[PDB]
Nucleic acid binder design. Structure first.
Lengths: 191, 191
DNA sequence: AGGCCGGCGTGA
DNA sequence: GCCGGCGTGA
Protein backbone atom coordinates (compact mmCIF):
# COMPACT_ATOMS: atom_id res chain seq x y z
CA UNK A 1 0.00 0.00 0.00
CA UNK A 2 1.32 3.39 -1.07
CA UNK A 3 1.06 7.07 -0.53
CA UNK A 4 -1.42 9.44 -2.05
CA UNK A 5 0.05 12.74 -3.14
CA UNK A 6 -3.37 14.20 -3.93
CA UNK A 7 -3.42 16.92 -1.23
CA UNK A 8 -6.44 17.39 1.07
CA UNK A 9 -7.78 20.36 3.00
CA UNK A 10 -9.12 19.30 6.40
CA UNK A 11 -10.03 20.72 9.80
CA UNK A 12 -8.66 19.36 13.09
CA UNK A 13 -11.30 18.35 15.62
CA UNK A 14 -9.12 16.64 18.23
CA UNK A 15 -5.61 15.51 19.13
CA UNK A 16 -4.31 13.20 21.84
CA UNK A 17 -1.19 14.20 23.78
CA UNK A 18 2.09 12.83 22.38
CA UNK A 19 2.99 9.34 23.59
CA UNK A 20 5.78 6.76 23.48
CA UNK A 21 5.63 3.54 21.50
CA UNK A 22 8.10 0.88 20.39
CA UNK A 23 8.76 -0.39 16.85
CA UNK A 24 9.28 -4.09 16.19
CA UNK A 25 12.92 -3.17 15.54
CA UNK A 26 12.93 -1.92 19.18
CA UNK A 27 13.31 1.77 18.28
CA UNK A 28 11.78 4.10 20.85
CA UNK A 29 9.45 6.70 19.27
CA UNK A 30 6.80 9.37 19.83
CA UNK A 31 3.48 10.02 18.05
CA UNK A 32 -0.04 11.36 18.45
CA UNK A 33 -3.54 10.58 17.26
CA UNK A 34 -5.77 13.18 15.71
CA UNK A 35 -9.20 13.41 14.15
CA UNK A 36 -9.83 15.66 11.15
CA UNK A 37 -12.75 16.56 8.93
CA UNK A 38 -13.85 17.71 5.54
CA UNK A 39 -17.33 19.08 5.07
CA UNK A 40 -18.47 15.65 3.98
CA UNK A 41 -16.28 13.16 5.85
CA UNK A 42 -14.02 12.56 8.77
CA UNK A 43 -10.72 10.70 9.21
CA UNK A 44 -8.69 9.25 12.05
CA UNK A 45 -5.09 10.27 11.57
CA UNK A 46 -1.89 8.88 12.99
CA UNK A 47 0.76 11.58 13.15
CA UNK A 48 4.20 10.02 13.47
CA UNK A 49 6.04 13.28 12.72
CA UNK A 50 5.45 14.77 16.12
CA UNK A 51 7.05 18.08 15.09
CA UNK A 52 3.67 19.05 13.67
CA UNK A 53 1.78 18.78 16.90
CA UNK A 54 1.65 22.51 17.08
CA UNK A 55 0.06 22.53 13.65
CA UNK A 56 -2.61 20.13 14.80
CA UNK A 57 -4.15 22.13 17.61
CA UNK A 58 -3.68 25.46 15.93
CA UNK A 59 -4.55 26.34 13.35
CA UNK A 60 -7.55 24.07 12.98
CA UNK A 61 -7.35 24.36 9.20
CA UNK A 62 -4.63 22.47 7.27
CA UNK A 63 -3.56 20.91 3.94
CA UNK A 64 -2.06 17.42 3.89
CA UNK A 65 -0.21 15.49 1.16
CA UNK A 66 1.99 12.40 0.75
CA UNK A 67 0.11 10.67 3.53
CA UNK A 68 -0.79 6.98 3.60
CA UNK A 69 -4.36 5.71 3.55
CA UNK A 70 -5.14 2.28 5.02
CA UNK A 71 -7.50 0.68 7.57
CA UNK A 72 -9.96 3.56 7.00
CA UNK A 73 -7.43 5.99 8.43
CA UNK A 74 -4.65 8.34 7.40
CA UNK A 75 -0.98 8.11 8.30
CA UNK A 76 1.03 11.34 8.32
CA UNK A 77 4.78 10.84 8.59
CA UNK A 78 8.14 12.39 7.75
CA UNK A 79 7.48 12.07 4.07
CA UNK A 80 4.10 13.75 4.47
CA UNK A 81 3.66 17.48 3.98
CA UNK A 82 1.33 19.48 6.23
CA UNK A 83 0.66 23.19 5.73
CA UNK A 84 -1.63 25.92 7.02
CA UNK A 85 -4.36 27.63 5.02
CA UNK A 86 -5.02 30.81 6.95
CA UNK A 87 -7.17 32.58 9.58
CA UNK A 88 -9.75 31.82 6.80
CA UNK A 89 -11.52 28.73 8.06
CA UNK A 90 -14.62 26.66 7.58
CA UNK A 91 -16.90 24.80 9.94
CA UNK A 92 -17.90 21.14 9.85
CA UNK A 93 -21.50 19.72 9.91
CA UNK A 94 -22.56 18.33 13.31
CA UNK A 95 -23.54 14.97 11.76
CA UNK A 96 -19.89 14.47 10.89
CA UNK A 97 -18.60 15.75 14.24
CA UNK A 98 -20.84 13.41 16.24
CA UNK A 99 -19.95 10.55 13.92
CA UNK A 100 -16.24 11.22 14.44
CA UNK A 101 -16.73 11.16 18.23
CA UNK A 102 -19.11 8.17 18.15
CA UNK A 103 -18.47 4.94 20.06
CA UNK A 104 -20.04 1.75 18.71
CA UNK A 105 -22.13 -0.44 21.02
CA UNK A 106 -20.55 -3.70 22.18
CA UNK A 107 -23.33 -5.88 20.74
CA UNK A 108 -22.56 -4.32 17.36
CA UNK A 109 -18.81 -4.68 17.89
CA UNK A 110 -19.29 -8.45 18.46
CA UNK A 111 -20.81 -8.59 14.93
CA UNK A 112 -17.95 -6.66 13.28
CA UNK A 113 -15.46 -8.13 10.83
CA UNK A 114 -12.06 -9.29 12.06
CA UNK A 115 -9.28 -6.84 11.15
CA UNK A 116 -11.24 -3.63 11.74
CA UNK A 117 -9.70 -0.72 13.55
CA UNK A 118 -11.71 0.49 16.54
CA UNK A 119 -11.79 3.83 18.39
CA UNK A 120 -14.09 4.54 21.35
CA UNK A 121 -14.80 5.04 25.05
CA UNK A 122 -15.75 2.14 27.31
CA UNK A 123 -16.19 1.38 31.03
CA UNK A 124 -13.66 -0.81 32.81
CA UNK A 125 -15.32 -3.59 34.80
CA UNK A 126 -12.35 -5.81 35.63
CA UNK A 127 -8.61 -5.93 35.01
CA UNK A 128 -5.92 -8.58 35.18
CA UNK A 129 -2.34 -7.40 34.82
CA UNK A 130 -0.27 -10.32 33.65
CA UNK A 131 3.47 -10.00 33.02
CA UNK A 132 3.59 -8.74 29.42
CA UNK A 133 -0.12 -8.27 28.72
CA UNK A 134 -3.11 -6.73 30.53
CA UNK A 135 -6.68 -7.97 29.96
CA UNK A 136 -9.13 -5.10 30.45
CA UNK A 137 -12.73 -6.27 30.69
CA UNK A 138 -14.86 -3.49 29.19
CA UNK A 139 -18.61 -3.05 29.55
CA UNK A 140 -21.72 -1.22 28.36
CA UNK A 141 -25.53 -1.52 28.34
CA UNK A 142 -25.42 -3.97 25.43
CA UNK A 143 -22.64 -6.41 26.33
CA UNK A 144 -19.03 -6.80 27.47
CA UNK A 145 -15.67 -7.81 25.96
CA UNK A 146 -11.93 -8.24 26.50
CA UNK A 147 -9.26 -5.69 25.56
CA UNK A 148 -5.71 -7.06 25.42
CA UNK A 149 -3.07 -4.40 25.97
CA UNK A 150 0.66 -4.76 25.39
CA UNK A 151 3.47 -2.21 25.22
CA UNK A 152 2.29 1.33 25.98
CA UNK A 153 -1.11 -0.28 26.53
CA UNK A 154 0.23 -2.71 29.13
CA UNK A 155 -0.24 -2.11 32.87
CA UNK A 156 -1.94 1.23 32.62
CA UNK A 157 -3.08 2.66 35.88
CA UNK A 158 -6.80 2.28 36.20
CA UNK A 159 -9.50 0.88 38.41
CA UNK A 160 -12.88 -0.64 37.87
CA UNK A 161 -15.57 1.82 36.99
CA UNK A 162 -13.11 4.14 35.25
CA UNK A 163 -13.65 4.92 31.56
CA UNK A 164 -10.95 4.02 29.04
CA UNK A 165 -10.64 5.82 25.73
CA UNK A 166 -9.10 3.56 23.11
CA UNK A 167 -7.27 4.57 19.99
CA UNK A 168 -6.33 2.39 17.08
CA UNK A 169 -7.15 -1.03 18.41
CA UNK A 170 -7.46 -4.10 16.19
CA UNK A 171 -10.64 -6.17 16.37
CA UNK A 172 -10.17 -9.90 16.43
CA UNK A 173 -12.48 -12.88 16.94
CA UNK A 174 -12.55 -15.51 19.64
CA UNK A 175 -14.56 -17.68 19.78
CA UNK A 176 -17.26 -16.16 17.65
CA UNK A 177 -16.98 -12.94 19.59
CA UNK A 178 -14.97 -9.77 19.32
CA UNK A 179 -11.99 -8.69 21.38
CA UNK A 180 -9.85 -5.56 21.03
CA UNK A 181 -6.09 -6.01 20.66
CA UNK A 182 -3.40 -3.35 21.22
CA UNK A 183 -0.91 -2.88 18.40
CA UNK A 184 2.17 -0.70 17.71
CA UNK A 185 0.28 2.59 17.46
CA UNK A 186 -2.55 1.81 19.89
CA UNK A 187 -3.19 4.09 22.83
CA UNK A 188 -5.28 4.14 26.01
CA UNK A 189 -6.13 7.34 27.86
CA UNK A 190 -8.20 7.68 31.06
CA UNK A 191 -11.26 9.81 31.90
CA UNK B 1 -27.46 -27.76 16.67
CA UNK B 2 -30.60 -29.02 18.52
CA UNK B 3 -31.54 -27.24 21.75
CA UNK B 4 -33.98 -29.09 23.97
CA UNK B 5 -33.84 -26.15 26.34
CA UNK B 6 -37.31 -24.73 25.62
CA UNK B 7 -37.94 -21.00 25.15
CA UNK B 8 -41.06 -19.11 26.26
CA UNK B 9 -41.84 -16.18 23.96
CA UNK B 10 -44.27 -13.60 22.67
CA UNK B 11 -44.63 -13.33 18.93
CA UNK B 12 -44.22 -9.73 17.74
CA UNK B 13 -44.55 -10.39 14.05
CA UNK B 14 -44.97 -12.99 11.31
CA UNK B 15 -44.85 -12.79 7.55
CA UNK B 16 -47.41 -14.56 5.39
CA UNK B 17 -46.25 -18.03 4.32
CA UNK B 18 -44.23 -18.08 1.11
CA UNK B 19 -42.77 -20.44 -1.50
CA UNK B 20 -39.02 -21.16 -1.79
CA UNK B 21 -36.72 -23.64 -3.54
CA UNK B 22 -34.34 -26.17 -1.94
CA UNK B 23 -30.98 -26.97 -3.52
CA UNK B 24 -32.43 -30.37 -4.56
CA UNK B 25 -35.03 -28.24 -6.41
CA UNK B 26 -38.11 -29.08 -4.29
CA UNK B 27 -40.57 -26.20 -3.87
CA UNK B 28 -41.63 -25.73 -0.25
CA UNK B 29 -43.40 -23.24 2.03
CA UNK B 30 -42.27 -21.42 5.20
CA UNK B 31 -42.63 -18.19 7.17
CA UNK B 32 -40.53 -15.77 9.22
CA UNK B 33 -41.32 -14.60 12.73
CA UNK B 34 -39.96 -12.23 15.33
CA UNK B 35 -40.09 -13.29 18.96
CA UNK B 36 -39.19 -11.97 22.39
CA UNK B 37 -38.73 -12.77 26.02
CA UNK B 38 -37.99 -10.63 28.98
CA UNK B 39 -34.32 -10.79 28.01
CA UNK B 40 -33.89 -10.50 24.23
CA UNK B 41 -35.54 -11.04 20.87
CA UNK B 42 -35.07 -13.61 18.11
CA UNK B 43 -35.61 -13.95 14.41
CA UNK B 44 -37.23 -17.29 13.71
CA UNK B 45 -37.50 -19.34 10.54
CA UNK B 46 -40.57 -21.58 10.70
CA UNK B 47 -40.43 -24.29 8.04
CA UNK B 48 -43.54 -26.03 9.35
CA UNK B 49 -46.29 -23.77 7.99
CA UNK B 50 -48.97 -25.68 9.92
CA UNK B 51 -47.81 -23.67 12.92
CA UNK B 52 -48.99 -20.33 11.53
CA UNK B 53 -51.86 -20.15 13.99
CA UNK B 54 -49.62 -20.93 16.98
CA UNK B 55 -47.61 -17.91 15.83
CA UNK B 56 -50.65 -15.64 15.48
CA UNK B 57 -49.43 -13.73 18.47
CA UNK B 58 -52.47 -13.76 20.68
CA UNK B 59 -50.78 -16.34 22.83
CA UNK B 60 -47.45 -16.84 24.57
CA UNK B 61 -45.78 -19.99 23.35
CA UNK B 62 -43.12 -22.57 24.25
CA UNK B 63 -40.73 -23.95 21.65
CA UNK B 64 -38.41 -26.95 21.87
CA UNK B 65 -36.22 -29.11 19.62
CA UNK B 66 -35.35 -26.02 17.62
CA UNK B 67 -32.08 -25.23 15.87
CA UNK B 68 -29.96 -22.29 16.90
CA UNK B 69 -27.50 -20.94 14.36
CA UNK B 70 -26.40 -17.68 12.81
CA UNK B 71 -27.97 -15.98 15.85
CA UNK B 72 -31.46 -17.18 14.92
CA UNK B 73 -33.86 -20.03 15.61
CA UNK B 74 -35.13 -22.54 13.14
CA UNK B 75 -38.35 -24.30 13.95
CA UNK B 76 -39.20 -27.16 11.70
CA UNK B 77 -41.12 -30.36 11.48
CA UNK B 78 -39.00 -32.05 14.13
CA UNK B 79 -39.60 -29.20 16.59
CA UNK B 80 -42.35 -28.99 19.23
CA UNK B 81 -44.44 -25.85 19.75
CA UNK B 82 -47.05 -25.64 22.52
CA UNK B 83 -48.90 -23.05 24.62
CA UNK B 84 -47.86 -21.60 27.99
CA UNK B 85 -49.98 -21.63 31.11
CA UNK B 86 -51.44 -18.65 33.00
CA UNK B 87 -48.47 -17.98 35.27
CA UNK B 88 -45.83 -18.25 32.55
CA UNK B 89 -47.24 -15.03 31.15
CA UNK B 90 -45.24 -11.80 30.78
CA UNK B 91 -44.98 -8.54 28.86
CA UNK B 92 -41.95 -7.40 26.90
CA UNK B 93 -40.30 -4.02 27.74
CA UNK B 94 -40.69 -1.33 25.03
CA UNK B 95 -36.90 -1.28 25.15
CA UNK B 96 -36.83 -4.79 23.64
CA UNK B 97 -39.68 -4.14 21.18
CA UNK B 98 -37.89 -1.09 19.82
CA UNK B 99 -34.57 -2.94 19.67
CA UNK B 100 -36.26 -5.72 17.71
CA UNK B 101 -37.44 -2.97 15.39
CA UNK B 102 -33.96 -1.39 15.05
CA UNK B 103 -32.31 -1.19 11.64
CA UNK B 104 -28.54 -0.90 11.41
CA UNK B 105 -26.78 1.95 9.59
CA UNK B 106 -25.38 0.88 6.24
CA UNK B 107 -21.84 2.13 6.84
CA UNK B 108 -21.77 -0.16 9.88
CA UNK B 109 -23.17 -3.04 7.81
CA UNK B 110 -20.23 -2.72 5.39
CA UNK B 111 -17.94 -3.37 8.40
CA UNK B 112 -19.84 -6.46 9.62
CA UNK B 113 -18.29 -9.93 9.53
CA UNK B 114 -18.76 -11.97 6.36
CA UNK B 115 -21.39 -14.67 6.78
CA UNK B 116 -23.59 -12.66 9.12
CA UNK B 117 -27.33 -12.92 8.72
CA UNK B 118 -29.02 -9.56 8.29
CA UNK B 119 -32.63 -8.44 8.78
CA UNK B 120 -33.70 -4.82 8.37
CA UNK B 121 -35.72 -2.07 6.72
CA UNK B 122 -34.06 0.21 4.19
CA UNK B 123 -34.92 2.92 1.70
CA UNK B 124 -34.61 1.87 -1.93
CA UNK B 125 -32.57 4.27 -4.03
CA UNK B 126 -32.19 2.31 -7.27
CA UNK B 127 -33.01 -1.11 -8.67
CA UNK B 128 -31.67 -3.14 -11.60
CA UNK B 129 -33.66 -6.14 -12.81
CA UNK B 130 -31.45 -8.61 -14.68
CA UNK B 131 -32.59 -12.02 -16.03
CA UNK B 132 -32.23 -14.24 -12.94
CA UNK B 133 -30.99 -11.69 -10.37
CA UNK B 134 -32.08 -8.24 -9.16
CA UNK B 135 -29.63 -5.65 -7.75
CA UNK B 136 -31.58 -3.46 -5.31
CA UNK B 137 -29.46 -0.50 -4.27
CA UNK B 138 -30.31 0.50 -0.67
CA UNK B 139 -29.54 3.85 0.94
CA UNK B 140 -29.51 5.92 4.14
CA UNK B 141 -27.69 9.03 5.29
CA UNK B 142 -24.64 6.88 6.13
CA UNK B 143 -23.95 5.00 2.87
CA UNK B 144 -25.35 2.63 0.28
CA UNK B 145 -25.19 -1.08 -0.47
CA UNK B 146 -26.23 -3.71 -2.99
CA UNK B 147 -28.82 -6.28 -2.16
CA UNK B 148 -28.55 -9.21 -4.57
CA UNK B 149 -31.90 -10.95 -4.93
CA UNK B 150 -32.56 -14.30 -6.61
CA UNK B 151 -35.38 -16.84 -6.46
CA UNK B 152 -38.28 -15.51 -4.45
CA UNK B 153 -36.25 -12.28 -3.97
CA UNK B 154 -35.80 -11.67 -7.68
CA UNK B 155 -37.82 -9.10 -9.66
CA UNK B 156 -39.98 -7.83 -6.84
CA UNK B 157 -41.99 -4.77 -7.76
CA UNK B 158 -40.80 -1.66 -5.99
CA UNK B 159 -39.71 1.83 -6.91
CA UNK B 160 -37.37 4.44 -5.55
CA UNK B 161 -38.49 5.72 -2.17
CA UNK B 162 -40.22 2.49 -1.23
CA UNK B 163 -38.85 0.79 1.85
CA UNK B 164 -37.71 -2.83 1.56
CA UNK B 165 -37.86 -5.11 4.51
CA UNK B 166 -35.25 -7.81 4.28
CA UNK B 167 -35.34 -11.19 5.99
CA UNK B 168 -32.40 -13.57 6.42
CA UNK B 169 -30.01 -12.18 3.82
CA UNK B 170 -26.36 -13.28 3.89
CA UNK B 171 -23.64 -10.67 4.10
CA UNK B 172 -20.84 -11.43 1.64
CA UNK B 173 -17.53 -9.73 0.77
CA UNK B 174 -15.93 -9.66 -2.64
CA UNK B 175 -13.16 -7.36 -3.65
CA UNK B 176 -13.37 -5.79 -0.18
CA UNK B 177 -16.95 -4.74 -0.76
CA UNK B 178 -19.96 -5.92 1.25
CA UNK B 179 -23.21 -7.04 -0.28
CA UNK B 180 -26.35 -8.66 1.05
CA UNK B 181 -27.04 -11.92 -0.78
CA UNK B 182 -30.52 -13.48 -0.96
CA UNK B 183 -30.60 -17.14 0.06
CA UNK B 184 -32.94 -20.16 0.29
CA UNK B 185 -34.98 -18.83 3.22
CA UNK B 186 -34.59 -15.17 2.33
CA UNK B 187 -37.59 -12.86 1.89
CA UNK B 188 -38.29 -9.28 0.75
CA UNK B 189 -41.48 -7.33 1.41
CA UNK B 190 -42.26 -3.74 0.39
CA UNK B 191 -43.66 -0.82 2.41
C1' DA C 1 -13.23 -22.64 15.25
C1' DG C 2 -7.92 -17.97 15.63
C1' DG C 3 -6.47 -16.06 11.04
C1' DC C 4 -3.91 -17.70 7.21
C1' DC C 5 -2.69 -20.22 3.36
C1' DG C 6 -4.25 -24.06 -0.11
C1' DG C 7 -7.95 -26.60 -3.16
C1' DC C 8 -12.17 -26.42 -7.24
C1' DG C 9 -15.59 -24.24 -10.99
C1' DT C 10 -16.12 -20.04 -13.43
C1' DG C 11 -14.29 -18.30 -17.68
C1' DA C 12 -8.91 -18.97 -20.20
C1' DG D 1 -12.38 -24.42 -23.45
C1' DC D 2 -5.84 -23.28 -18.39
C1' DC D 3 -4.54 -23.11 -14.17
C1' DG D 4 -3.42 -20.46 -10.04
C1' DG D 5 -4.20 -17.08 -7.34
C1' DC D 6 -5.75 -14.00 -4.28
C1' DG D 7 -8.97 -12.43 -1.06
C1' DT D 8 -12.51 -15.12 0.64
C1' DG D 9 -14.92 -18.94 2.49
C1' DA D 10 -14.57 -23.56 8.14
Amino acid sequence: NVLQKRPVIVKVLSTTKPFEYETPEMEKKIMFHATVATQTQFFHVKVLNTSLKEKFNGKKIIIISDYLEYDSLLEVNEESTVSEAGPQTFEVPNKIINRAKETLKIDILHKQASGNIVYGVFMLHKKTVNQKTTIYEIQDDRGKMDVVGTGQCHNIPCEEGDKLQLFCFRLRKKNQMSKLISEMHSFIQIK
